[PDB]
Amino acid sequence: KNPKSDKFKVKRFHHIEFWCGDATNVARRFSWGLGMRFSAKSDLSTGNMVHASYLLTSGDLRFLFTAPYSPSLSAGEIKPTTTASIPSFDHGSCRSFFSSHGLGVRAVAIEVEDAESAFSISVANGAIPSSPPIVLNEAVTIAEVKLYGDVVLRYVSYKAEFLPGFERVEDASSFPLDYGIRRLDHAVGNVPELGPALTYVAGFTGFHQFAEESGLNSAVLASNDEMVLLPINEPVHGTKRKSQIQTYLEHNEGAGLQHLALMSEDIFRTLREMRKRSSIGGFDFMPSPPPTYYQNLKKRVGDVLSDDQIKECEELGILVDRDDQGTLLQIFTKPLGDRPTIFIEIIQRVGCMMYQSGGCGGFGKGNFSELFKSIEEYEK
Amino acid sequence: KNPKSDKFKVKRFHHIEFWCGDATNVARRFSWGLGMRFSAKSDLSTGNMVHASYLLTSGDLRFLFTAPYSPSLSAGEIKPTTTASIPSFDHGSCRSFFSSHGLGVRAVAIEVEDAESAFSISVANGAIPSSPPIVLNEAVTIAEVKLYGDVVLRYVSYKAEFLPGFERVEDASSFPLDYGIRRLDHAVGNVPELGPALTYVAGFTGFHQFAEESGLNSAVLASNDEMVLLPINEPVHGTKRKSQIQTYLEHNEGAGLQHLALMSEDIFRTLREMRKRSSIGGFDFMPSPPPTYYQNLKKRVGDVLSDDQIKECEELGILVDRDDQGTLLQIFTKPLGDRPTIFIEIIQRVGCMMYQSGGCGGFGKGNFSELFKSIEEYEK
């Protein structure tokens, strides 16, 4: 069931913003690890005396990395005279965020028809305001409300490249890396209590619940066309194996973004390319399932994947799960930074063709049981 | 003249420690950019609930990257029960350092015969104590005094791998990168006033001045065998071209480490390898000199480098300077992080064979004039 209850017109995920201590080093690491090209910048070289922001792109996926400069560089500015390109930025907020949580996502940004109306309707329906609508160069409107923890949901709307005040990156600095990643499929939050978090977010967005003891309960909120997908997890306590959600909440100092799932147009190429780079600056992957897991894929998805395609999943450590409508290929990185908090998921979905409908195949919750079963089976 | 006036027995540069917001991302970026292998770790996986520290090595060069965890993880600890592997570490100090200065060097570490005696003699001769001598696992002693700004000079001495409590890195995570870098040649500080900084450091070390308007005055302090080399720069004001030392001091919020010069055993291979990676996660280099600079190298070093070797310098943008005793090949990166503060120099020295004596060929001060001359000549 999809009641299509969005309280304002939502388009697609627009970008994800990381708050960093040093944006340059995080962005360069991510660029090489994920195959994303440097596309835009806002920093001292573009007249921004407040923050350094670097944009990476792969297809429609946009990762923004932002860090504060010394406040002394902008001490004479006021908000009417700011040189910041992102008007919601605040030195103290950014330093406090990073000290509390470490490297992680500050903003989940969605493009909407009218960011001012989205903000007004959201706050009228219970959203906690974070940054009011600001019109940039009479061209783009940006507004922010609290999502969970210190993560904001950022609304962006365009009258008619990223944001005014950003400059396209010099091509010599813009190597055309591409490992096949094409868009953000979903963005997942960890919270102490799922119920109140769902009520709050669904309350101000009108997002509906998307149709679905390893230590979590989860639910998924979705926009009208189910292209914006926001799962939320809570821990399940006293499970004998400590909940990874609870570990997250401890090391993160509370609620925050758990993972970003990045859709690939060719998950086999993406994983070949990422795994080649894991130990030379890129990202590591979680330990692969035992071969019994792939010996059990024939009965589960033998009508979707050939033996060769299943063997290629086994070579790359890719997990497979299935809906009543489609099939999901997925794999998970180790944490992106020092803390056992945020990580990345690479996914590709097969089925649900009409274009492909959002969430085809689900989110892989079936792989909690199937991976445990494979592990005990391989114990043999 | 070398009075050999060291007040305690100094051996060699031991390591350089960067204080970071996220040690993982900086270390992975540096590993790929410089060709350094992951050699040791101290972090949650080794029982350290205080800080994440990752060691990169290339030859004898040791780069350590450290970031603080949430203080909550270690809130019940006291110094007698600490799980930190580096006892001088302090969450507040590290966060304050990084907020003030951004990514940069906290510790210049030299190996000495006896870190306790080096500390005592240093403080008796005016050194400002930073961290008292602490014996780690009855095997290694570490102590710290202030060098300049918030940079410390760290003394390390060994009774008889890096530090107790560090673990050798799993080989799968230890890709054997190597672009030819072999050791730290010198470490350079920027200060507002050169005179008082030289008097202070030479005062407590016994280091002697090493025998030598672009906006700086500098002098070099050296140990008895001139293998530990610590240049210090001050700005020259009112120069019509703003002093890069003054720009540093502004963006860094005061004195700090300006550059690390890394000796390569094959500077041509090192630069080929680093430049291949500049736009795919590595380091960028300063804009190369005009061809008139290389058209003028024949008269300057035509008896040291062949035409082909000069042409190879031109291909890679390498600078050349000359002493009365030897010749220096050098090149400079763009700043390592967001702020126009710290950068890296790659160098190789030719001549002064006895082993090669320290500082052979100087520090390239001749290239201020010669690069400007080449630029006006190429204006033509």
Ligand SMILES: C=CCN1CC(=O)N(C)c2ccc(C(=O)C3=C(O)CCCC3=O)c(C)c2C1=O
């Ligand atoms: C990274 C290591 C832990 N891990 C271990 C593991 O074995 N399996 C099988 C999964 C399977 C699916 C998902 C997942 O993507 C997801 C949910 O967990 C809840 C619904 C929404 C959502 O998107 C995750 C995060 C993990 C997982 O995290």
Ligand SMILES: C=CCN1CC(=O)N(C)c2ccc(C(=O)C3=C(O)CCCC3=O)c(C)c2C1=O
């Ligand atoms: C990075 C861009 C600025 N730049 C521009 C430039 O054109 N030249 C020619 C040099 C030449 C030598 C050195 C240098 O290594 C050094 C001293 O400056 C003082 C004595 C001790 C020392 O080691 C530096 C840092 C630079 C330099 O920084």
Ligand SMILES: [Co+2]
């Ligand atoms: Co997921």
Ligand SMILES: [Co+2]
């Ligand atoms: Co130098």
